Design a protein around this ligand. Structure first.
Ligand SMILES: *[C@@H]1O[C@H](CO)[C@@H](O)[C@H](O)[C@H]1NC(C)=O
Ligand SMILES: *[C@@H]1O[C@H](CO)[C@@H](O)[C@H](O)[C@H]1NC(C)=O
Ligand SMILES: *[C@@H]1O[C@H](CO)[C@@H](O)[C@H](O)[C@H]1NC(C)=O
Lengths: 198, 681
């Protein structure tokens, strides 16, 4: 075959619109998500929330290096305590767009041999029945675009309950963290350091 | 699709041939009736405004010219074998009246008598004389040629017509050449194609740099280069039924590129002497042959000579390009091997048809021998024939929905033909091995055929279509398609392993096909069929039809599907095909398909359709050569190769610009807003 100089008006617009549409998508998604605060509510509830977070981090952070100081905390603890839209919106709409404006062409030649049923779906524009395995219509180039475009976005540069009973649940975890795990540090540090830095 | 390029792309010429009778009109006095190109069953009658080339209408009527006479005006015509007579109105060709009881009257048409009344040519220059007071008004030079004055009208809408040269014809009025006509092109027998075309390492680096940097130091959509790149610009060399060759441009509405006159007195065939497409050999009816040099300049007759025996020739069959042989069939049924020139076991088989039979012939040792014969019996008569056109191969098998394959039947040595027998009323179809003579298939139809309407046969890639008229289903035109498959079983390659088997056709150990056939109901009577092509047999092969009225129509191959189903049993019947269009026997006519949208295109009694390949595979040329010449650019599937003539590129560009402006709106905004508001610096 001999396709004639439509490489300007389709292939470039297809890559170009994918580039702009995704860059816009990241800008739009970033715009849509705004917290701008936690809330504007009274003082107390965030205050005891961060107390709860202090307990939570004590589970991870402070529950390792406190062989002497483990028990001293626990008295205190008990007393003190007690996008899919981003997928759907752009790309489905532009499937309609491309089939609307770009149809009924053989746009290019993929380099690789597909199987016949790939050649079933891709050429809905053309109405030949034994054309070839390799040639493809316009919409196939889109089908290759969406899954291959992550390097482009990198290279241009872009990047990514009950109020009281749950307190009792973490008080039960305060009870659990007493002797569920007493971690072996401030005992093996001499062994570990002599094992290393030689 | 059509409205944009309706008359721009379609390219019609109308020919009348050398005049025989011309009669002035009862009304619209700047108008006559033009009678031309007699033939033993009919002749060409037309109506024409004299002051232009504007033909008003044309008709082929089934009478020898002599019957056509004025009344006692009303242009009476009388059959002589019977007593059948037709009275036709001059102005609008209405058949005023008919009879068989008696002719109304006749008046044999008067002779010119132009001399002694209006004509004098004395100083090698013409002078129109008044009958009295012979003042020699309206004098005019004789051109280089002059044969006759066809017609002259002295009344207020003055007109004069000259047969200046054998083929050039000039209209005049009060002298001034007013219009020009050429009727050398009235009947072409055989055709040929000529195309036109444009016009260590370290040093390579720099010379490439210099030449391309000189290159390096907006769209403008120009049409002329597009034409030549895709092969549209071409020279058609047409051979007339008379002796004339000439080059006609495939672009620019067929301006005559060049015209050469022979002395062969009727033409039969055309051949390029070699693949170079530089030198033709052209055959006389009388038994001469000419060798002609085709150049961008006007041609030159580089040779004339006899054949070995000065005998009348019926036809010529092209033998090998490389071996430079040709076969000549003379009437009296005499065959001559033809070793023409240098052009400055290994058997060959050649096969020819008559109404008496199909014969087959073999060449060996610089001689021709009959290889077999097959004549129909007395009452019978062979009617329609076609061979297998060679084909470049794309797909060895037709597939099914569940990636299953039926292996369409590819045997190259095939021809197909018809037999019609009276009183049996049996159109018999045979699909014969053209080498051996085995039949492989019989299909009769006792459906009350007519034998009076045209029937024709075309041989496809793996399929055959022939068409006939008959009554017993209904009195309607009938297309019959047969499709040839290696095995009717859903997945079987019957005896086609090819690694090294190297099958022999001459012996007859070849596979034999199974077939499936259907037919269809068609509105209009079909004269003749052929097949569209491109260089590669890729698109749907787009059967082209030529009708009785002169109209052309293409219908795709796919609507004619044998193994189609009546569409109750197709519904998610997974095994059938990919998007099997149903069988649907009733094919209504769709005017969108038709070429020659409002053109008349009188093709004459004997005309041919040919398919000329081009590049740009969506497009193909199909040409109707014969009494009238006509061609087109035709798309089987609608244009998929061409980008478009009719994009809304401005809408696309503007939408892209909408993207860019919305970028310009949001990027400073959103970057500042969100980074600084979420950081609350
Ligand atoms: C008859 O032909 C002449 C020549 O072109 C043209 O000028 C004239 O209009 C025609 N007659 C009619 C009724 O159009
Ligand atoms: C007159 O009619 C007969 C009847 O068929 C036909 O054979 C003959 O050809 C007709 N005359 C001419 C001149 O064609
Ligand atoms: C008749 O012959 C002349 C001389 O060769 C040439 O111009 C042309 O073929 C014809 N001329 C005219 C005026 O028809």
């Amino acid at each position: 075959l001999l396709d004639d100089q439509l490489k300007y008006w389709v292939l470039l617009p297809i890559s170009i619109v994918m580039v702009l549409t995704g860059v816009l998508k990241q800008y739009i998604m970033t715009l849509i998500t705004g917290s701008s605060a936690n809330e504007a509510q009274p003082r107390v509830k965030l205050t005891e929330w961060q107390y709860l977070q202090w307990a939570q981090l004590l589970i991870g952070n402070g529950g390792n290096l406190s062989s002497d100081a483990f028990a001293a905390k626990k008295e205190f603890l008990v007393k003190d305590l007690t996008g899919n839209m981003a997928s759907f919106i752009p790309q489905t709409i532009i499937m309609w767009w491309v089939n609307h404006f770009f149809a009924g062409f053989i746009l290019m030649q993929l380099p690789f041999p597909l199987t016949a049923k790939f050649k079933e779906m891709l050429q809905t524009g053309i109405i030949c029945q034994d054309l070839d395995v390799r040639w493809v219509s316009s919409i196939s180039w889109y089908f290759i675009s969406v899954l291959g475009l992550n390097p482009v976005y990198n290279l241009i540069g872009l990047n990514d309950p009950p109020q009281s009973q749950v307190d009792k649940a973490m008080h039960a975890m305060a009870n659990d963290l007493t002797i569920i795990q007493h971690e072996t540090c401030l005992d093996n540090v001499e062994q570990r350091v002599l094992k290393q830095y030689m | 699709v059509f409205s944009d390029d309706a008359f721009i792309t379609d390219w019609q010429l109308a020919n009348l041939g050398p005049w025989e009778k011309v009669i002035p009109d009862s009304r619209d006095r700047n108008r006559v009736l033009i009678l031309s190109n007699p033939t033993e069953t009919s002749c060409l009658v037309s109506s024409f405004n004299v002051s232009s080339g504007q033909i008003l209408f044309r008709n082929v009527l089934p009478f020898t010219i002599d019957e056509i006479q004025l009344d006692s005006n009303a242009m009476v015509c009388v059959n002589s074998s019977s007593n059948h007579w037709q009275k036709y109105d001059l102005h609008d060709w209405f058949l005023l009246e008919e009879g068989v009881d008696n002719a109304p009257s006749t008046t044999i048409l008067p002779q010119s008598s132009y001399l002694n009344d209006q004509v004098s040519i004395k100083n090698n220059e013409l002078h129109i004389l008044d009958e009295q007071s012979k003042l020699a008004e309206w004098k005019l030079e004789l051109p280089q040629g002059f044969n006759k004055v066809e017609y002259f009208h002295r009344e207020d809408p003055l007109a004069l017509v000259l047969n200046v040269n054998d083929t050039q014809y000039m209209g005049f009025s009060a002298l001034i050449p007013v219009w020009q006509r050429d009727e050398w092109l009235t009947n072409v027998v055989d055709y040929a194609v000529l195309d036109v075309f444009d016009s260590s390492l370290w040093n390579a680096y720099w010379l490439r740099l210099t030449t391309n940097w000189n290159r390096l130091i907006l769209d403008a959509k120009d049409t002329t280069v597009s034409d030549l790149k895709f092969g549209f610009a071409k020279i058609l060399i047409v051979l007339t039924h008379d002796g004339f060759i000439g080059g006609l441009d495939m672009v620019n509405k067929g301006q005559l590129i060049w015209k050469l006159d022979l002395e062969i007195d009727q033409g039969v065939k055309m051949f390029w002497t070699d693949k170079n497409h530089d030198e033709l050999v052209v055959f006389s009816h009388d038994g001469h042959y000419l060798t002609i040099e085709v150049t961008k300049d006007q041609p030159i007759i580089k040779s004339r000579s006899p054949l070995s025996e000065r005998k009348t020739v019926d036809s010529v069959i092209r033998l090998n390009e490389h071996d430079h042989q040709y076969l000549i069939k003379f009437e009296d049924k005499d065959h001559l091997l033809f070793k023409l020139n240098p052009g400055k076991s290994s058997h060959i088989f050649v096969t020819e048809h008559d109404t008496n039979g199909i014969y087959g012939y073999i060449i060996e040792n610089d001689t021709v021998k009959q290889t077999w014969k097959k004549a129909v019996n007395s009452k019978e008569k062979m009617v329609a024939y076609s061979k297998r056109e060679t084909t470049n191969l794309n797909t060895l098998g037709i597939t099914l929905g569940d990636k299953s394959v039926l292996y369409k039947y590819l045997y190259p040595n095939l021809a197909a033909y018809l037999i019609a027998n009276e009183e049996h009323h049996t159109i018999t179809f045979n699909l014969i091995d053209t080498i051996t003579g085995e039949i492989l298939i019989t299909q009769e139809h006792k459906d009350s055929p007519d034998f009076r309407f045209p029937m024709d046969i075309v041989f496809g890639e793996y399929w055959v279509v022939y068409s006939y008229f008959s009554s017993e289903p209904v009195p309607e035109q009938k297309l019959v398609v047969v499709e040839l498959y290696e095995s009717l079983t859903p997945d079987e390659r019957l005896s086609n392993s090819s690694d090294n088997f190297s099958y022999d056709p001459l012996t007859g150990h070849i596979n034999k096909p199974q077939f499936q056939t259907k037919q269809f109901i068609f509105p209009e009577i079909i004269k003749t069929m052929s097949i569209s092509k491109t260089t590669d047999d890729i698109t749907t092969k787009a059967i082209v039809m030529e009708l009785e009225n002169g109209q052309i129509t293409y219908i795709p191959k796919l609507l004619l599907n044998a193994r189609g189903k009546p569409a109750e049993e197709m519904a998610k019947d997974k095994k059938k095909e990919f998007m099997a269009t149903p069988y649907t026997p009733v094919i209504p006519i769709n005017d969108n398909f038709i070429i020659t949208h409002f053109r008349n295109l009188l093709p004459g009694s004997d005309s041919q359709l040919i398919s000329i390949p081009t590049n740009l595979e969506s497009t193909s040329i199909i040409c109707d050569l014969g009494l009238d010449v006509f061609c087109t650019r035709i798309t089987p599937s609608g244009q998929f190769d061409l980008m478009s003539p009719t994009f809304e590129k401005g809408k696309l560009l503007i939408t892209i610009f909408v993207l860019l402006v919305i970028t310009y709106f949001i990027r400073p905004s959103v970057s500042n807003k969100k980074l600084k508001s979420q950081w609350l610096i």
